[PDB]
Amino acid sequence: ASRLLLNNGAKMPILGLGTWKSPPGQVTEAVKVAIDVGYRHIDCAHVYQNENEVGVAIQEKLREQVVKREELFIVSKLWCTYHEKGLVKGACQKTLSDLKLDYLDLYLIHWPTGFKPGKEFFPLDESGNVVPSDTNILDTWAAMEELVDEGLVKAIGISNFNHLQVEMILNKPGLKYKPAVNQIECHPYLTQEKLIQYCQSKGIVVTAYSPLGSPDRPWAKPEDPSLLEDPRIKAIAAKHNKTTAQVLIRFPMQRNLVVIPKSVTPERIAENFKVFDFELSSQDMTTLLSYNRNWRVCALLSCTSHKDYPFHEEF
Numbered sequence: 001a002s003r004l005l006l007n008n009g010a011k012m013p014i015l016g017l018g019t020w021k022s023p024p025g026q027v028t029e030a031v032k033v034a035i036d037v038g039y040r041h042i043d044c045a046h047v048y049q050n051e052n053e054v055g056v057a058i059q060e061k062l063r064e065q066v067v068k069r070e071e072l073f074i075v076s077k078l079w080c081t082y083h084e085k086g087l088v089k090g091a092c093q094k095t096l097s098d099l100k101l102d103y104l105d106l107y108l109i110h111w112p113t114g115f116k117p118g119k120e121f122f123p124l125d126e127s128g129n130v131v132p133s134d135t136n137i138l139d140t141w142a143a144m145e146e147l148v149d150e151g152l153v154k155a156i157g158i159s160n161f162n163h164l165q166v167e168m169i170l171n172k173p174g175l176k177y178k179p180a181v182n183q184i185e186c187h188p189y190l191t192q193e194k195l196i197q198y199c200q201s202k203g204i205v206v207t208a209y210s211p212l213g214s215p216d217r218p219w220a221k222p223e224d225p226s227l228l229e230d231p232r233i234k235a236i237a238a239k240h241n242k243t244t245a246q247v248l249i250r251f252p253m254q255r256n257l258v259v260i261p262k263s264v265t266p267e268r269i270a271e272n273f274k275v276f277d278f279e280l281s282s283q284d285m286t287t288l289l290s291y292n293r294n295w296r297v298c299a300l301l302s303c304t305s306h307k308d309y310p311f312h313e314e315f
């Protein structure tokens with residue numbers, strides 16, 4: 001399969017381009033190359049501060065009739081400072097304006113943790129903890145449902161939600177729309193078996209982020225865990241005559257996940273797409289799952305006392 005079916009009846013391309021830390025100076029070309037080579041899914045966010053430059057790329061490719069809007073699957077996310085119910089629509093509309101689109105295919109709650117509204121992405125106190133908002137997950141969900149009902153987005157979902165947080169939404173009295181997708185960190189060092197099984201059992205598609213272990217994450221040292229340099233994964237790559245990145249991208253695909261590797265490098269954008277023409281073996285899959293070490297690149301550590309912090313739970 002090149003696409004997975006969502007609970008709104010749309011089909012979500014299983015490979016997408018990530019855009020976190022894709023600078024304004026390079027992301028337009030990155031998106032253009034990606035669309036050229038065949039990516040039909042772009043993962044965006046207001047907090048990435050590059051949606052205008054993504055929007056330019058998309059628009060140019062639509063106008064040049066390289067791709068049809070209906071063939072593209074564009075995702076963005078609601079930032080934590082816009083969880084208050086009256087702020088959600090404006091946040092979505094700003095993303096739509098910046099991306100130069102009339103609708104999003106999917107709009108996610110980026111984190112379950114609301115922050116105080118205002119100009120700062122991360123409002124902080126002297127303890128190094130975030131200033132929260134008095135919002136709750138269910139009220140924010142209700143505001144997200146209104147975006148579907150108004151035509152601004154085709155589907156809504158969540159990101160970095162744990163299974164109890166998912167459950168809270170699913171059991172909401174008067175629920176209108178289930179989450180379509182839960183986008184979570186997933187890779188061989190954080191395999192998320194239990195949460196994936198949960199979501200899959202509930203008909204929620206999982207998108208795996210940081211599939212290459214986010215080697216460009218801020219202040220990575222070379223001594224930290226590196227998936228791309230794990231000799232055991234290199235060995236699997238060598239056996240298939242593929243790159244380590246191609247193995248790491250193919251892995252989630254064989255778990256029936258969506259995956260969103262990021263690159264601004266044209267050669268890597270192109271090479272990372274060559275994942276539809278080989279299979280990892282059963283033993284490969286088992287072996288990679290065995291490398292789980294509960295290592296999170298994205299642990300939201302400024303927010304560990306937030307009532308909606310997602311990572312205290314086992315899954």
Ligand SMILES: NC(=O)c1ccc[n+]([C@@H]2O[C@H](COP(=O)([O-])OP(=O)(O)OC[C@H]3O[C@@H](n4cnc5c(N)ncnc54)[C@H](OP(=O)(O)O)[C@@H]3O)[C@@H](O)[C@H]2O)c1
Pocket residue numbers: 017018019020021043044110159160183184208209210211212213214215216228243245246260261262263264265268269271272298
């Ligand atoms: N929902 C959330 O909370 C959340 C959190 C994290 C990530 N995300 C999404 O997931 C996307 C992917 O995760 P990520 O950006 O953290 O990390 P990633 O995709 O695991 O890794 C990105 C890094 O890998 C490098 N790279 C790409 N292809 C490579 C290849 N073939 N060989 C070697 N290095 C390669 C990139 O370098 P170059 O760009 O320099 O080529 C970049 O530094 C994000 O961009 C964002 O869209 C969402």
Ligand SMILES: O=C(O)Cc1nn(Cc2nc3cc(Cl)ccc3s2)c(=O)c2nccnc12
Pocket residue numbers: 020045122210214217218297298299300301302303
């Ligand atoms: O979370 C995202 O969507 C992308 C992202 N964003 N960021 C930016 C920041 N995250 C945080 C988190 C906190 Cl709790 C505080 C400041 C920052 S700045 C990353 O550092 C990072 N590192 C690895 C993988 N993805 C990321």
